[PDB]
Amino acid sequence: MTNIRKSHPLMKIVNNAFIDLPAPSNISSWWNFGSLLGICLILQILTGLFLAMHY
Amino acid sequence: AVSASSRWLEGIRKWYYNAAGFNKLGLMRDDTIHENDDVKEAIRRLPENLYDDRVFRIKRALDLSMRQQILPKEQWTKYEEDKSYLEPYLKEVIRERKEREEWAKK
Amino acid sequence: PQDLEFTRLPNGLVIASLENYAPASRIGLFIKAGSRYENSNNLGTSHLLRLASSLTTKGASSFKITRGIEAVGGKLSVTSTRENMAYTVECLRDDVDILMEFLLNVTTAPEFRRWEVAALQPQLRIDKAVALQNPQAHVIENLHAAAYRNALANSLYCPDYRIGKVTPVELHDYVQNHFTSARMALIGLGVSHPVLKQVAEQFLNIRGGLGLSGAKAKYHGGEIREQNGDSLVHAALVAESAAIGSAEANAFSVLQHVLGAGPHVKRGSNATSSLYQAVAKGVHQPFDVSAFNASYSDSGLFGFYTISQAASAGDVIKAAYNQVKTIAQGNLSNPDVQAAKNKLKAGYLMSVESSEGFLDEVGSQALAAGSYTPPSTVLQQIDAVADADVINAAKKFVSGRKSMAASGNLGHTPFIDEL
Amino acid sequence: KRSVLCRESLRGQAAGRPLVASVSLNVPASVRY
Amino acid sequence: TATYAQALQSVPETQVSQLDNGLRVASEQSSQPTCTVGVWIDAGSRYESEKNNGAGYFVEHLAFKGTKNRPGNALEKEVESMGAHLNAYSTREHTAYYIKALSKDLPKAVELLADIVQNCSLEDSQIEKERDVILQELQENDTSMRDVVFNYLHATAFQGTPLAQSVEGPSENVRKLSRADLTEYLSRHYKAPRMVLAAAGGLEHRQLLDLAQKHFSGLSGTYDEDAVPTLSPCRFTGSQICHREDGLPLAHVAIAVEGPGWAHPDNVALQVANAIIGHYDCTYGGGAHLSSPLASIAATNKLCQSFQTFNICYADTGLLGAHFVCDHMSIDDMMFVLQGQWMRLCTSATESEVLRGKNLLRNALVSHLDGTTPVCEDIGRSLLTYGRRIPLAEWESRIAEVDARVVREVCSKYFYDQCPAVAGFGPIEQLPDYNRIRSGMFWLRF
Amino acid sequence: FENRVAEKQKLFQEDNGLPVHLKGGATDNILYRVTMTLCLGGTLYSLYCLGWASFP
Amino acid sequence: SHTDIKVPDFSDYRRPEVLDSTKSSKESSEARKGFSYLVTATTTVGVAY
Amino acid sequence: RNWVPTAQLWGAVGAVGLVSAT
Amino acid sequence: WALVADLLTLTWIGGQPVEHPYITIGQLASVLYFLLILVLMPTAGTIENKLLKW
Ligand code: HEM
């Protein structure tokens, strides 16, 4: 490969678990809670750090 | 001594079979199996016909699941047609491994 | 103490036995399937069959088979030739029974499973590759397919193109037709004949006539030449020998030895070998050569084998011929025939001085003749050869359709018209 | 591969009953004459 | 009917006998056609000094090319026309020449052999003809990884000792070697008691004994002044010798832990141990189902091409280990399984497993003895090795005392916490660092 | 489990001219000497106590 | 050719106990492992403190 | 097998560890 | 589903005065939860397997 951004950096390859990964077709709405799970972890954190900026 | 009792299980069996929805999906009982190490080897032992079949069936099935659509009433798996085609293969695989285990006692 | 004991049954399978003194007993069922029993469509099947001895069978799973013999320290050898297929089975006195039941499953109850046979396949390549490391095997093989047309011209190793194509009904068919009663001969080196028979009777009764493969013999002169990059070149020059267990044959054998150069001394050179002397004189420093002699049921192959370097190929090759022509011109003095003879006699005896040797010798005889000829008798026959007789045979190579096979840089290897 | 340079060469095939006999055994394995 | 044990006890005992000079006579009778008479001299490579490192091996090329009685090709012609074969083998501890021959041929057999040992017509021409040959053999032995590597092993586990030298000897010692030097060599080491005249088959011991040409004897001391051990211990060293040649297609690795002399109770128990690990090749028919793990793993995972465990037995030294040939990328995995098999063996042996190996042993040790040649070498070598006993029926007994705890405790002496002798002829790029192979011999984890 | 009475039978039947209470090694010996030491010392100590208690 | 190989003189780097070209290392090296393992057991014992 | 005797010295180590360390 | 609804039932108790009414309820819900998880489901599994002839 040449200038395939993704696998060029080794780091950026590690991020291709989001984009290129095998994901089953059929899949209830239930699985979105994984992702949202992370969403919440990131929101609490940003929020926490600002509150702990005045607590 | 099973004449009345065991000739009526088929009645719950039959009930149960169509209760579990996989009937409707176009799938069969053997294709609903938990793919573990024994199933796996059985699987591998399948002829091209049997085996490609199980791939289309599951293809058609996961397609339906993805679209939340049931197959037409006319095209459903009927209990009377229980292809237990994995069973034969699956038994041995186990049979082999039980032996292996046993031979390893002492 | 007790000598062997043959017994032909109603089926026609032979069985022998020698309760020996020593600790180790060895059975060996010799079935009459050689490579010669396959057709254009069936080539390579014995090969795979030979390699598939430890697969699941009706009464014993590949795992039990292997682990079982290991349990007791047993060996299971499955040897074949162009004509026969010896299925050897060694183990300790006490364990014959556990072992025998193994030999019987392997041979009468094979279950070639699509999946099992399939994983073997690749083994054929690995096996072919390791035996094709000795020039002798590819040349010696090339020889047989040049010299024959149809049956014995089939090689022992599966043809490259066939390998993965060996199908389970093929294996099943081959066993069924060839692994039968009339073609079988049990042989024990430390078992009771009385108990042997019983077993034989109980497990070896299957029907199958000969030649459902396409039996028949035929010789055709021809040359197979394989170019290489190797310094050294090997070539074989051979004419229809006399057949198996016949006088002519026997004569050949004696002649073979008058020229025959299988060193009897480490680091030692033959003084006796005419071929070697004659070749040697007209030849360079480094080289080696020897008399080849093959004998089968319906044909033979006699002649020599050479190993020369690029430029010396011809010189050696002709040299060797010329010398064998000498014997055919009549030039051969009594003193050398008797040496020969004694050489032969000594060899055959050492051949049979071991269990393994004896067991082969015996089974071998049971598929040819139908009984065991004792050594002595054997010895007598070889002696009956006339000094002339030898010459006469020899006369036949020089005046018998040529058939050669060589390998290496062939700039300097005579063709048929060259010699 | 074993180098075959010297006088040592002494390989040519010819036995009594057996000729070019190829063994395949569960443990060992080989090619004889 | 007859049962293993029985057979065992019924076997023809070996008769050991002595001439006035110490010529040892042994023989096992069977009243059979062929006979293999042999003279098993025990002055090997390990007596050689740096110069005559290849002395003995040189004599062996001259052994069969003339006696003052039997000049140029008179030896061969004689053997041949009888139909007898004549072989000479040389070891780092044992030289031996034997004849295979019709039993009626003893008369001129034993004469020949005797002749051979003593009178060897060796002219300058034969010396300069052999040199060239030797130098050419050497070149050809460099073409064999297995031979190249096993030499290495010895050299590194014997670094700094007479024993570490090739039996083939130094290149240039062949060139240099003085004609006078083969004499002193022979003269000093072919003197029995060293020698043994052994034989098996159809002969009567009585006649062997008598037949022995009583011509020259041991010109040595009657007292302890001789007792200065010519068999002086050879210092044990755990080092590695790594000779990397990425040019080569495969990789040979010989890994060893020093072991017992020829005679020792621990020395049969070891064997039973290696029975278990076993030996394996691309062409084994059992592969994945073979009962020895290294084999199964190997078979299964295409781990290696071929592997064999060995027990090299010397009077004061012993090389123990296995040897595996494996692709460039699999050197470490096979190291891991192997060493792993060792440790598991000295801590977790199970009676089942040791009982299977046991039985393997018996067979290996009975089947070897099939044939005349075999028996003869066991009888000859057995006498300089183990002294004048023939432990054949004992074996089964000794082999019988084997227990899973016996096997475990004996294996732990030699392998556990011991420092390995490792050599390879690369692709050794992936060959484990000496410290890694070291820590492989103790169990924290892995 | 094990079963190696066969090894011990051999060890104890070995003709080393040793008495059974020592036939088994070095530990047998230390155990012996410890026991013997404690006994003799104890006996000495006891005699001291009696000599001591004999007096008012 | 691969026989004119010698392993180099290690005499400077080895040690007292196993320097004896002509004698056994088995009845020498029992201790040698002790002393090295001793060092380990001590370190690991002080560090533990 | 050797596991009892080894599990018993591993047993002991933990114990003496706790006891002491704690 | 029942476990889930048993779990809902338990959550309810949480905001309840610790008195008879709630006590007695919670206690049977806490046994139900562990039955559902430890004993009921596992058996049901088997049954279903046996009705399918598995
Ligand atoms: C998922 C992980 C976290 C969860 C579940 C969580 C949850 C909570 C909850 C329930 C409270 C009580 C707020 C209230 O009811 O008044 C709180 C307060 C607080 N958290 Fe978080 N939090 C998380 C991560 C963080 C992080 C990462 C930070 C800092 C970077 C943080 C900083 C604070 C601060 C400073 C307060 C105190 C002031 C307040 O009551 O807002 N938290 N957190």
Residue E5 lies in a domain: no
Residues in chain I: 54
Q: Is residue C316 part of a domain?
A: yes
Other chains touching H, judged by 3 or more CB pairs under 8 Å: E
Using the Cβ of C115 and the Cβ atoms of chain B, whether some distance falls under 8 Å is answered with yes
Distances (CA, A) of F33 to B104, F11, F12, F40, F47: 48, 22, 21, 10, 21
The reply to whether B66 touches chain A by the CB within 8 Å rule is yes
Chains G and E physically touch (3 or more Cβ atom pairs below 8 Å)? yes
* Disruptive mutation site among E347, E352, E416 for chain H (greatest number of H CBs within 10 Å): E347
Pocket of ligand 1 contains residue A27 by CB under 6 Å: no
Min Cα separation B36/chain E (Å): 20
Which residues in chain A are contacts of B64 at CB distance < 8 A? 26
Residue type, C192: S
Residue C316 CB partners (closer than 8 Å, separation 6+):
C279, C282, C283, C287, C289, C306, C308
Q: How far apart are CA E61 and CA B102, in angstroms?
A: 58
Question: E158: Cβ–Cβ under 8 A, 6 or more apart, which residues?
Answer: E164, E234, E235, E237, E317
Question: Please, which residues have CB within 8 angstroms of residue D13's CB and are 6 or more apart in sequence?
Answer: C136, C140, C290, C292, C305, D19, D20, D33
CATH of the domain at C394: 3.30.830.10
In a shared domain, residues C105 and C21? yes
Q: Are residues E49 and E189 in the same domain?
A: yes
Residue with tokens 């006035």: E20
Domain shared by C228 and C200, yes or no? no
Domain final position from C147, C182, C207: C207
The verdict on the CB of residue A55 being under 6 Å from ligand 1 is yes
Q: How many CB atoms lie within 10 A of CB C369?
A: 13
Residues in Cβ contact with C309 at an 8 Å cutoff, skipping those fewer than 6 apart: C231, C232, C233, C284, C286, C287
| Ligand 1 site, residue A49, Cβ cutoff 6 A | yes
Interface test with G, best of E159, E241, E439 (most G CBs within 10 A): E159
The phi-psi region of residue C44 (left if phi > 0; otherwise alpha if psi is between -120 and 50; otherwise beta) is: left
Neighbours of E423 (CB within 10 A): 27
* Experimental method reported for this structure: cryo-EM
Which of B27, B62, B70 would best serve as a mutation to test chain A binding (most A beta carbons within 10 A)?
A: B62
Q: What SS3 class is residue C26?
A: strand
Which ligand 1 atom is nearest residue A49's CA? 30
Domain edge (last residue) among E198, E227, E256: E227
DSSP B32-97: GS---HHHHHHHHH--HHHHHHHHHHHHHHHHHHHHT-PPPGGGPPPTT-----HHHHHHHHHHHH
Residue E234, in any domain of the structure:
no
Answer yes or no: is C312 within a domain.
yes
Torsion of CA B60, B66, B68, B69, to 10 degrees: -30
What's the CA gap between E381 and E352, in Å, rounded? 33
Q: Which chain I residues are Cβ-neighbours of B17 within 8 angstroms?
A: 51-52
DSSP state of I37: I
Topology (CATH) of B8-106? Cytochrome Bc1 Complex; Chain F (1.10.1090)
Domain closes at, from C151, C185, C207: C207
Residue nearest to atom 22 of ligand 1 (CA): A44
Same domain (yes/no): C173, C262: no
C239 and C185 inside one domain: no
Looking at the fold, whether E80 and E106 belong to one and the same domain comes out as yes
Tokens of C225: 């030449």
| In a shared domain, residues E253 and E306 | yes
Residues C179 and C265 in one domain: no
Whether the CB-CB separation of C17 and C191 falls below 8 Å is answered with: yes
In 3-state terms, what secondary structure has residue C85? strand
Domains of chain D: 1-33 (2.10.210.10)
Question: Are residues C352 and C252 both part of a single domain?
Answer: yes
- Write the CB contacts of E202 (distance below 8 Å, at least 6 apart in sequence): E29, E30, E31, E32, E33, E34, E35, E103
Q: What is the Cα–Cα distance from D29 to E80, expressed in whole angstroms?
A: 31
CB contact under 8 A, B63 and A27: no
- Which residues, in sequence order, are CB contacts of H17 under 8 Å at separation 6+? none
Residue E1 counted as domain residue: no
Specify the 3-state DSSP secondary structure of C31.
strand
Tell which residue, E86, E87, E426, E38, has the closest CA to residue E208: E38
Do the beta carbons of residue C55 and residue C113 sit within 8 Å? Answer: yes
Contact E281 D8 (CB under 8 A): no
Which residues have CB under 8 Å from E376's CB, separation 6+? E36, E37, E38, E98, E198, E199, E200
Q: Which chains touch D (3 or more CB pairs under 8 A)?
A: C, E
Q: Specify if C212 maps to a domain.
A: no
Torsion on CA atoms E158, E160, E162, E166, rounded to nearest 10: 60
**B103 interaction partners in chain C (CB closer than 8 Å):** 63-64, 67
DSSP element (H, E) containing E254: strand E252-258
CA distance E382 to E40: 10
Which domains, from first to last, does chain G contain? Answer: 1-49 (1.20.5.270)
On whether residue C214 sits in a domain, the answer given is no
Angle at E335 between CA E333 and CA E338, to 5 degrees: 110
Exposure class string for C384-400: b at 16+ Cβ within 10 A, else e: ebebebbbbbbbbbbeb
Report how far ligand 1's centroid is from the alpha carbon of A45 (Å).
8
Strands E17-18 and E24-25: antiparallel
Beta carbons of C337 and C393 less than 8 angstroms apart: no
Resolution in A: 9.1
Structure tokens at E224: 């302890």
**Which residue in E354, E403, E352 sits closest to B102, CA to CA?**
E352
Residue E165 lies in a domain: yes
Residue E222 lies in a domain: yes
Q: How many residues does chain G have?
A: 49
Q: Which of C364, C12, C369, C46 is nearest to C209 (CA)?
A: C12
Q: Do D26 and C75 touch (CB under 8 A)?
A: yes
Query: Are C23 and E1 within 8 A, CB to CB?
Result: no
Nearest alpha-carbon partner for E381 in E204, E373, E118: E373
Do C177 and C309 lie in a common domain?
no
Q: Which residues sit opposite E333 in a β-bridge?
A: none
Residues of E in contact with F6 (CB under 8 A): 401, 403
The structural domain count of chain C equals 2
Contacts of C157 in chain D (CB under 8 A): 22
Distance from the Cα of C302 to chain B's closest Cα (Å) equals: 50
Q: Is C82 in the same domain as C173? A: yes
Which residue's alpha carbon is at the smallest distance from atom 41 of ligand 1?
Answer: A51
Residue nearest to atom 35 of ligand 1 (CA): A52
Active-site position among E13, E48, E50, E60: E60
- Outline where DSSP puts E strands in C195-242: 223-227, 232-239
Measure E355 CA to nearest chain B CA, in Å.
Answer: 10
Q: Which residue has the tokens 């199908």?
A: C167
Contact yes or no for F14/F25 (Cβ under 8 A): no
Same domain, C301 and C337: yes
Residue C114, chain B, CB below 8 Å: the answer is yes
- Contact status, residue C218 vs residue C36, Cβ threshold 8 Å: no
Whether C242 and C361 share a structural domain: yes
> Do E318 and E269 fall within a single domain?
yes
What one-letter code names the amino acid at B80? E
Which tokens belong to C172? 């099943």
Tell me the Cα Rg of chain G.
17
Among C61, C67, C114, whose Cβ lies nearest the Cβ of B96? C61
Q: C115 to chain B: which residues are within 8 Å by CB?
A: 44-45
Domain of E118 in residue numbering reads as 14-227
E149 inside domain: yes
**3-class DSSP state for residue C290?**
strand
Distance of residue D12 Cα from the nearest chain E Cα, in angstroms:
17
* Rounded Cα–Cα distance for residues C362 and C367 (Å): 9
Q: Is ligand 1 within 6 A of the CB of residue A54? A: no
Domains in chain F with CATH codes? 1-56 (4.10.91.10)
- Closest of D17, E201, D15 to residue C353, by C-alpha: E201
Same structural domain, C324 and C413: yes
- Do residue G4 and residue E170 have CB atoms under 8 angstroms apart? yes
Which of E195, E227, E259 finishes a domain? E227
Instruction: For residue E147, give both structure tokens.
Output: 């031979």
Do strands E24-25 and E196-201 pair parallel, antiparallel, or not at all (unpaired)?
parallel
Task: Give CA–CA dist A36/H9, Å, rounded.
Answer: 49
C vs E, Cβ pairs < 8 A, gives 155
In this structure, are E140 and E284 located in the same domain?
no
One domain, residues E152 and E122: yes
Chains interfacing with G (3 or more CB pairs < 8 Å): E
The atom of ligand 1 lying closest to the CA of A52 is: 35
**Smallest CA–CA separation between B98 and chain E, in Å?**
15
DSSP C345: H
Whether C74 and E359 have beta carbons less than 8 Å apart is answered as: no
State whether the beta carbon of A11 lies less than 6 angstroms from ligand 1: no
Place of tokens 């106590």: F49
- The answer to whether residues E423 and E356 belong to one domain is yes
**Can you give the CATH number for the domain in which E337 is found?**
3.30.830.10
Domain that holds residue C403: 219-419
Last residue of a domain, one of C180, C207, C234: C207
Residue E78 falls in the annotated catalytic set: no
